[PDB]
Amino acid sequence: TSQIRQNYSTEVEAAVNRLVNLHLRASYTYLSLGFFFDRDDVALEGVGHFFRELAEEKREGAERLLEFQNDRGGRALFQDVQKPSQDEWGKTQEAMEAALAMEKNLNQALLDLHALGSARADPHLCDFLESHYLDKEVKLIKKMGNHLTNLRRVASLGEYLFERLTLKHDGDIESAQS
Amino acid sequence: TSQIRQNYSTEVEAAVNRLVNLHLRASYTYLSLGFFFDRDDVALEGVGHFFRELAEEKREGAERLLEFQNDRGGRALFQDVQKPSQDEWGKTQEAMEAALAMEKNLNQALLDLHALGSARADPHLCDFLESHYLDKEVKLIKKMGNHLTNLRRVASLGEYLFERLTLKHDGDIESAQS
Amino acid sequence: TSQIRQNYSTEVEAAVNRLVNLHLRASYTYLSLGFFFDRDDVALEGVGHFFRELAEEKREGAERLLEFQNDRGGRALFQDVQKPSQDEWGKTQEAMEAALAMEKNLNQALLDLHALGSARADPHLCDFLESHYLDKEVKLIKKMGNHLTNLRRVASLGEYLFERLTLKHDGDIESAQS
Amino acid sequence: TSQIRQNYSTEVEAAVNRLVNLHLRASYTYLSLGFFFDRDDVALEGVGHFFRELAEEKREGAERLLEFQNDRGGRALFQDVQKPSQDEWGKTQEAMEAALAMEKNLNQALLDLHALGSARADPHLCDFLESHYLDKEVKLIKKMGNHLTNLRRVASLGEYLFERLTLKHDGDIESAQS
Numbered sequence: 001t002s003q004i005r006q007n008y009s010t011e012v013e014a015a016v017n018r019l020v021n022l023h024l025r026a027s028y029t030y031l032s033l034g035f036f037f038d039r040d041d042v043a044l045e046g047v048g049h050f051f052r053e054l055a056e057e058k059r060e061g062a063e064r065l066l067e068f069q070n071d072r073g074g075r076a077l078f079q080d081v082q083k084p085s086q087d088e089w090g091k092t093q094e095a096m097e098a099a100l101a102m103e104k105n106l107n108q109a110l111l112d113l114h115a116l117g118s119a120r121a122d123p124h125l126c127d128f129l130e131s132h133y134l135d136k137e138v139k140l141i142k143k144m145g146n147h148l149t150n151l152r153r154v155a156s157l158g159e160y161l162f163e164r165l166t167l168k169h170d171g172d173i174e175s176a177q178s
Numbered sequence: 179t180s181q182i183r184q185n186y187s188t189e190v191e192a193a194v195n196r197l198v199n200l201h202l203r204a205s206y207t208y209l210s211l212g213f214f215f216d217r218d219d220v221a222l223e224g225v226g227h228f229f230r231e232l233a234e235e236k237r238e239g240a241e242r243l244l245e246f247q248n249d250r251g252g253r254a255l256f257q258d259v260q261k262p263s264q265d266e267w268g269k270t271q272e273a274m275e276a277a278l279a280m281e282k283n284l285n286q287a288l289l290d291l292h293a294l295g296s297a298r299a300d301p302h303l304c305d306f307l308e309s310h311y312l313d314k315e316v317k318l319i320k321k322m323g324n325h326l327t328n329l330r331r332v333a334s335l336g337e338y339l340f341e342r343l344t345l346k347h348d349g350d351i352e353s354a355q356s
Numbered sequence: 357t358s359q360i361r362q363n364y365s366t367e368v369e370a371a372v373n374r375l376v377n378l379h380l381r382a383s384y385t386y387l388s389l390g391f392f393f394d395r396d397d398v399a400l401e402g403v404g405h406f407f408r409e410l411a412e413e414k415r416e417g418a419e420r421l422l423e424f425q426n427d428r429g430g431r432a433l434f435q436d437v438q439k440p441s442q443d444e445w446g447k448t449q450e451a452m453e454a455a456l457a458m459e460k461n462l463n464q465a466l467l468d469l470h471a472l473g474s475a476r477a478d479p480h481l482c483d484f485l486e487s488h489y490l491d492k493e494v495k496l497i498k499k500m501g502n503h504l505t506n507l508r509r510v511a512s513l514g515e516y517l518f519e520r521l522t523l524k525h526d527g528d529i530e531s532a533q534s
Numbered sequence: 535t536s537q538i539r540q541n542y543s544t545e546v547e548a549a550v551n552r553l554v555n556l557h558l559r560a561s562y563t564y565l566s567l568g569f570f571f572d573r574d575d576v577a578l579e580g581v582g583h584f585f586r587e588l589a590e591e592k593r594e595g596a597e598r599l600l601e602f603q604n605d606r607g608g609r610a611l612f613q614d615v616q617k618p619s620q621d622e623w624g625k626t627q628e629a630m631e632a633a634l635a636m637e638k639n640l641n642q643a644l645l646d647l648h649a650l651g652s653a654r655a656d657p658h659l660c661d662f663l664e665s666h667y668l669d670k671e672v673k674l675i676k677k678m679g680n681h682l683t684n685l686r687r688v689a690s691l692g693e694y695l696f697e698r699l700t701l702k703h704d705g706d707i708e709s710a711q712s
């Protein structure tokens with residue numbers, strides 16, 4: 001009924017609303033992780049900052065899907081952001097596997113959205129995804145896999161050394177380009 | 179027969195030629211609108227400048243489709259640019275609805291071209307469209323819908339106030355980034 | 357059991373966890389509002405940006421309470437961020453009253469936390485609140501009351517004029533000091 | 535009997551004098567620690583510099599309490615700064631636990647002073663503490679807890695690696711902002 005709504009199926013409009021809730025829940029989990037590794041009894045502040053500046057990006061990916069919902073004339077329907085899966089994540093390895101299994105699951109939702117959009121012949125949606133989400137997500141998953149193998153390589157002196165030499169070293173340059 | 183022609187169906191080559199004529203006719207209509215709101219008896223110079231810098235962009239979108247026709251090895255076939263629909267557009271609201279119904283119709287042609295190109299498996303054409311036309315067009319339609327609802331909100335002191343506070347305010351920053 | 361936990365009652369640690377969920381839910385509501393006033397059929401982009409840069413600040417107030425939970429040695433317990441109350445907010449006036457009734461309710465929670473903290477003789481908590489939350493909140497409520505009376509004064513040409521002359525005028529200077 | 539003495543109970547004036555002696559004794563202990571880790575047979579110069587620039591801050595906290603004693607019209611009564619508890623501190627871990635148990639004990643004295651000051655309705659004293667001592671102390675204790683868990687994580691190659699990668703890395707930036 002919107003005046004600007006054109007070639008925007010309701011199945012896509014609803015599949016997008018379930019994708020913003022996924023991004024928000026994924027930003028909530030990363031927020032929980034980033035505030036778990038700054039606890040006094042873990043103190044892996046490099047990992048904490050990594051997950052923190054990851055929640056920033058996930059939430060930004062959520063509001064970029066909402067402004068796309070408005071540009072196409074859809075109606076944003078919010079749902080309850082379900083709480084993270086765990087409150088204790090454990091060693092950084094068992095946490096980065098719970099953060100990679102959440103990306104590979106969030107990336108699967110993006111691929112299903114792109115499959116749905118190509119099924120209803122929505123070129124603008126497929127372009128928007130291809131441009132803003134898919135490549136970022138495969139690069140993030142690649143980075144997490146690198147972190148995971150480096151963590152299995154130093155497997156807890158090795159975990160401290162990893163947080164100091166890899167994660168902190170990149171957190172320093174984030175604060176430089178920021 | 180062109181030496182560089184590769185994977186460029188004649189159905190796409192002809193559908194593109196009908197799309198440059200559409201862009202040219204749409205730039206002609208915007209040219210008529212931009213010189214209607216600078217008439218002495220309308221004097222909505224903000225609306226005039228808006229439609230003027232819109233005709234610039236539509237024409238640029240036409241010559242970007244022609245240089246794509248050359249890159250792919252097609253032959254540009256020009257047709258008579260049919261004159262605009264009206265010579266009197268009336269109040270700015272009834273003109274911005276005749277300018278939005280022309281975008282949503284020009285955007286439909288782009289989507290049909292992208293559907294045809296995906297039917298003949300022309301990835302370069304779909305990428306070219308997705309990159310240069312589709313997103314620009316949905317953003318322009320969104321902007322026009324915003325203008326339309328703001329015009330219905332002030333519905334003629336309100337029309338003058340709108341031209342002064344929205345359109346002129348953005349024309350000033352166009353002349354800044356220009 | 358934490359090594360750094362000192363003079364940090366569990367009643368405060370739990371009352372803080374219910375305050376971060378309040379801040380997150382309040383940032384979720386403001387996110388819903390900021391993406392409701394950029395809808396094509398409302399197009400009060402000034403109000404949209406106001407609520408958007410308000411959700412930023414509410415969420416920042418949430419992660420500043422979480423890092424305080426870590427500094428004092430508490431354990432952050434996340435809960436389901438309940439979805440906003442409405443999906444349609446209506447005119448900007450009826451939305452700014454639902455955004456002020458949410459501040460005066462979020463400010464009441466801060467005052468109850470400060471009363472609890474003073475009951476258990478926690479000076480650091482009362483100082484943290486007094487410094488970072490209370491004054492910001494009374495200033496924000498004052499600003500919202502100003503907006504509300506200015507909206508009742510122009511009571512829909514007046515609503516457009518308000519969004520153009522008050523909210524947009526301050527959004528321009530936000531983007532300047534930002 | 536002082537002309538400027540107003541709302542400054544003698545119980546607070548005496549409790550402050552016992553707090554400057556505590557700060558001085560704590561700066562004496564940190565001075566002993568900072569000159570123990572530069573011994574030729576320990577040579578953890580990063581830890582040495584950490585405790586050294588910690589004694590600076592503790593002593594500064596002592597003379598900031600003395601100038602507050604003068605501003606309120608009290609009389610500074612000095613006592614014998616009792617010598618540090620140990621002359622051999624051992625491994626850096628067993629020293630950072632003797633330096634954290636001294637902070638959590640110095641922070642307890644500040645909280646007792648703030649409880650006494652609130653008992654005699656001395657708002658200026660509670661504000662002075664809340665502003666200058668309490669938050670600094672909880673942040674320092676948090677930092678020490680981080681150091682302690684990182685030291686237990688690398689638990690003596692790990693101790694050298696810690697001193698090199700954490701403590702020296704921050705000593706370099708101290709000498710930059712200094």
Ligand SMILES: [Fe+3]
Nearest residue numbers: 127130305308
């Ligand atoms: Fe593409």
Ligand SMILES: [Fe+3]
Nearest residue numbers: 482483660661
């Ligand atoms: Fe107080």
Ligand SMILES: [Fe+3]
Nearest residue numbers: 483486661664
């Ligand atoms: Fe205070």
